[PDB]
Design a protein around this ligand. Structure first.
Ligand SMILES: CO[C@H]1O[C@H](CO)[C@H](O)[C@H](O[C@@H]2O[C@H](CO)[C@H](O)[C@H](O)[C@H]2O)[C@H]1NC(C)=O
Ligand SMILES: CO[C@H]1O[C@H](CO)[C@H](O)[C@H](O[C@@H]2O[C@H](CO)[C@H](O)[C@H](O)[C@H]2O)[C@H]1NC(C)=O
Ligand SMILES: CO[C@H]1O[C@H](CO)[C@H](O)[C@H](O[C@@H]2O[C@H](CO)[C@H](O)[C@H](O)[C@H]2O)[C@H]1NC(C)=O
Ligand SMILES: CO[C@H]1O[C@H](CO)[C@H](O)[C@H](O[C@@H]2O[C@H](CO)[C@H](O)[C@H](O)[C@H]2O)[C@H]1NC(C)=O
Lengths: 15, 133, 133, 15, 15, 133, 15, 133
């Protein structure tokens, strides 16, 4: 798609 | 809780959050940098009140977060983020909240935190971070 | 000319530029996407007038630029960008301006254009593009 | 620094 | 997938 | 310990490590993917012996690590990595070692682990991970 | 320099 | 022609190509850097012979390519890459081949070329480049 991506780490907390 | 996703930006200038020393983290809001100018992110608020606010103003761009740590645990039957600590290349901000439960920490060797996403109900349920070079 | 640098964003929603079929590209402005919302970039204008405007509205996020091409050449003794063509996965917009001089083209196999920088005096002197995954 | 970086190609036109 | 991605510009030449 | 740095690759195909249920993690070696072909990384070995080996063969590229967790703690006066657990989109490998001490975990929402660096003396002193899209 | 960069998280363990 | 794809690496140390001043570019091979060590890429050869070879040894990592330019044109009815020029922060290598046809150029303001892909039959049909920070 035409939307930029970034690395994302997590989540921490409730699953 | 209500999920939120600020997305990715150019950096972080300020963090405004609230906590309760008996429960967990409440409100969360970030002022990001967007290509050299401040960009005020949406204020993500708890469904309830009674939290103590704190403002973390970073000396952007010379000062930046190098490590985020905290604790997750049960509060009223819900797993939430009970405390947060932000360590930059200059100071250590926190811990804010209750340092009880299961610890976690994300040290960054190369790269920057450029965004946050998560969920807040009565408290901060969970959160994730966007990383970039 | 006066240099400008919009920086990097999440995508591109619309491009507004002007040209003169006898000279070169004049004004340049972009409406970017910033994490799902439109972000109106600054309008970078020529020092002079007499240009024909055109609006390029993309069907974001399904439509995106796959190739940028154009021509550079001398106008009144200055090397400037005389024409631009934007090819997306749906249509081809342009050429706008004068298709004379030295051609250039940037086809993108994987990635996206997420920002522009350059300089505009009487005409668009030069420009560069930010690319990201 | 605390400023994010991106690949940049160009410039095309005057040097 | 489990395969890393990189920006790729081109191609120049035959289409 | 002796520091090592494998660098960044295209993905991970296999991990070979050893542990001792009374102490901590010992040897560490990774078979990476390098643009479609296997690339055998250097074997980083403990200064001592007596460890139990294990091979973690991933179904590359359909299977990939989504979370790495473990424990750090003191062993003979040294802070080391006592256990590791690798969770992929298909199975959970581990825990290997001793699940005692301070826990840590790195869940990945978007991105891939593409490399490892660290230090090993008698045991794995510390380690870091390269992340990429 | 002419050496590619990548995001690196850690280290966990001894400091 | 026969397509090839070297993939992405850490940098470029040396380029070995061949050309014919009457036709176009022929053979193409690159010695990449892979996390501090040389990695010899596959030699991509023309289906025919009669080319003049040239070796471009870069002073890695202090020297790196900042711009790639060349010409594309028809040779025996096929559109191929007729010439290439590599400009680094230290020297300019080339032009190699025939500087006739349609020019193209890729100047890099921020980032590095870390890989090549393309196709070679009698001559280099086309090529693309991997870019990274
Ligand atoms: C008192 O309940 C609200 O506040 C808690 C703690 O902040 C939760 O956000 C809770 O939401 C529920 O959370 C779980 C996980 O812990 C799961 O996501 C449920 O689907 C969700 O409703 C929240 N209540 C509501 C209804 O928003
Ligand atoms: C008529 O002069 C103005 O418009 C031209 C074309 O758009 C240039 O922008 C020109 O600027 C001068 O440009 C050269 C390169 O072509 C170099 O950058 C000079 O330093 C710069 O002054 C511009 N005039 C002015 C003074 O802005
Ligand atoms: C028994 O000593 C060796 O094994 C331990 C545990 O694996 C350490 O690697 C130790 O190295 C020393 O480690 C500290 C941190 O915990 C610090 O980095 C010291 O400078 C380092 O010597 C290792 N011994 C040696 C000499 O390599
Ligand atoms: C003499 O024919 C061979 O060499 C030329 C120039 O290098 C081409 O590579 C040609 O391949 C054909 O190329 C076109 C585009 O220009 C298209 O890709 C055709 O499908 C392809 O066969 C090559 N011949 C062969 C059969 O490999």
């Amino acid at each position: 798609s035409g939307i930029s991506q970034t690395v994302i780490v997590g989540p921490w907390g409730a699953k | 809780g209500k999920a939120f996703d600020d997305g990715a930006f150019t950096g972080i200038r300020e963090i405004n959050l609230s906590y309760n020393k008996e429960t967990a983290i409440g409100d969360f809001q970030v002022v990001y940098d967007l290509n050299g100018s401040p960009y005020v992110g949406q204020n993500h608020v708890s469904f309830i009140t009674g939290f103590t606010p704190v403002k973390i103003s970073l000396d952007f761009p010379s000062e930046y977060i190098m490590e985020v740590s905290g604790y997750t645990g049960n509060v009223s039957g819900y797993v939430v983020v009970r405390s947060l600590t932000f360590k930059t290349n200059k100071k250590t901000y926190g811990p804010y909240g209750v340092t009880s439960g299961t610890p976690f920490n994300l040290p960054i060797e190369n790269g920057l935190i450029v965004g946050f996403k998560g969920s807040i109900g009565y408290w901060l349920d969970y959160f994730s971070m966007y990383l970039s070079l």
